[PDB]
C-alpha cells in the first residue's frame, strides 16, 4: 500500500541538514532519484507531500533541507536567510549540491538517473544547481523566481529544463523570463516554458493565500497541469 | 484493429468542401469530436494522419478542407488563397465554422463535446473560430501564426486554449505572442502557452524542410511533447 519516508542527515560545511527521503518499499532495486527543493519557508508539509507523490510514481525522492536543522520560517522572519542565498550564489549552490549528494547516497537511487524539482525559491535553486553542470537528467521549476545566470555559467546546464510559470505572477518580471529563455536558446538546452493562465505565485500550494503575502494564490488547474507536464517529462527521459 | 475514414461533402456559400472524417468503428455511440485544420498548403497527408491519430485516441475527427474542392497548393502558388483569408477574417471564420458544422453533423459526434486543433494557418484558424464564440471545449494550436484579435472579439472565446509554440520560430513575432496572451489575461480565458525550445515553424511535420521555405523544420521532440499536452487537455476536459 503506502509510501514510506525516513530522515536523512547530511552536511554542507558546518551546517547540518535533515532531509526526508520518500520511496516505495513495494518496489525493489535502484530507481530514478528526485531532489525536491521547498519554498523559502523551508522544509514543510507541502514539500514532503510532493516527495510522497513522487515515490508513488516510482521515484526515490528527497525533500531537501536548505536552511539547516530542518528550520522553517514564516513570512515575517524570512529575509535572513533568503538574501543570504541571493547575495552569495556560490554558497546557495553548495547547499543545493549537498541535497543532491544526500539523494545519490541512498541505495535505492540510480545515480545516473537523477532530477530536481522545486517550488518558488526551490525552483530558483534547481536552476542554480543545474548551472553548476551537475549531472541532472531534468529540472522542473514550479512558480520559480528565477535569476539571470552568473558570468561563467554559459554552456553548463546538462539537464532538460521545464519551467512551469504562473502567467500573472507579479513577483517574476517579463525581462527576467526573456533573459533566461535567451540563455537556454544560446546554449541549445533541451528546454520548455509552460505559461499557465490565471495563475500567480505559489500556485501549487492550497495554503498560498494563508501567508498574507501579496501575489500568492493557489490554482488547482495550474497545479494539476504543471504536475502532469513534470510527470510526462520524467517518463520520457527515464526508463 | 484499424481506424476508418470517409469523405464528407459540405459547403460554405458557393464553395464546396470535401473533408475527411476519421473514427473507430470498434467504438459505438457518440464521442467527442475534433476538427483538424491543416497548414496553408491545404488538406494533405499530414492533416489526415493527425485525424487518424485522434480517432485512435477515441475521438471522431474531421480533417477540414478550408480551400474547397480538396485543393492543395505548393509554396509557390499559395498567397492568393491565404491573403484572401487575412484580408477578410469574417470570410475566414465562416469557412472554419462550415468545417465545425460538418463535424457536428456526423452521428458519431457528441455535439456538446467538440474541439479544434490546427497547424500553422490551421492554428490561426482555430483562434479565429474561437473568437466567434463558437461552443468549443478546447482549441490547440501547433506552430500557429496567430493574429491579434479584431475589434469586437473581446470576451467571446468560450474554449480552453493551448498554444504550442516553437520558441525559435522566426515567422511569429514576440509582440504578437505577448498581445494574444494579454487578450487571454484580460478575458480570463482558460489558457496555456507552451514554448518548445529548439523548435521553429512547422515543427510537427517530418517534411517541414521539403518546401524550401526558410524558418520551417521538423522537431520530433516538440511534435511529441505538444501532442501529449493536447491529449492531456482533452482527457482533462472530456469525459
Ligand atoms: Cl490531477
Ligand atoms: Mg546541451
Ligand atoms: Mg471564460
Author numbering:
A (entry chain B), B (entry chain A): -1 to 237
Article sentences:
A microfluidic screening platform is used to recover and identify various hydrolases from metagenomic sources by screening for the hydrolysis of two substrates: sulfate monoesters, containing one of the most unreactive functional groups in biology, and phosphate triesters. The high sensitivity of our platform enabled us to isolate enzymes with strong and weak activities, including promiscuous side activities that have not been selected in the course of evolution and could not be predicted by sequence homology. Applying the screening workflow to PTEs (using triester 2d as substrate) led to the isolation of eight unique and novel sequences, mostly originating from unknown microorganisms. (iii) One hit, P91, is a member of the α/β-hydrolase (α/β) superfamily related to dienelactone hydrolases (DLHs).
Members of this superfamily possess a catalytic triad41, whereas most bacterial PTEs described to date use catalytic divalent ions to activate a water nucleophile. The X-ray structure of the protein was determined at a resolution of 1.7 Å and structural alignment with a previously characterized DLH43 (also identified in the SSNs) confirmed an α/β hydrolase fold, and highlighted a homologous catalytic triad in the active site of P91 (C118, D167 and H199). Site-directed knockdown mutagenesis of C118, D167 and H199 led to enzyme inactivation, consistent with catalysis by the cysteine-based catalytic triad in P91, which was expected to provide nucleophilic and charge relay catalysis. We observed electron density consistent with two orientations of C118. Figure 5b highlights potential ‘protecting' residues (E37 and H141) that may play a role in stabilizing an inactive conformation of the nucleophile cysteine, as previously invoked. The lack of electron density in the vicinity of the active site supported the absence of a metal-binding site, underlining a role for the triad instead of a metal cofactor in catalysis. Functional tests further ruled out P91 as a metallo-enzyme: treatment of P91 with chelating agents did not affect its activity towards triester 2a, whereas a reduction (or complete abolition) of activity was observed in all other PTE hits tested. However, P91 is the first metal-free bacterial (or archaeal) triesterase to be described, unrelated to insect carboxylesterases. The comparison of the Michaelis–Menten parameters (kcat/KM and KM) of our triesterase hits with those of (i) OP hydrolases isolated from pesticide-contaminated soils and (ii) enzymes with known promiscuous triesterase activity suggests that paraoxon 2a (or parathion 2b with lower or similar catalytic rates measured) and, by extension, the synthetic triester 2d are not the physiological substrates of our hits. This conclusion was also supported by the experimental verification of higher activities in P83, P84, P90 and P91 towards lactone 8c, thioester 7 and ester 6, respectively.
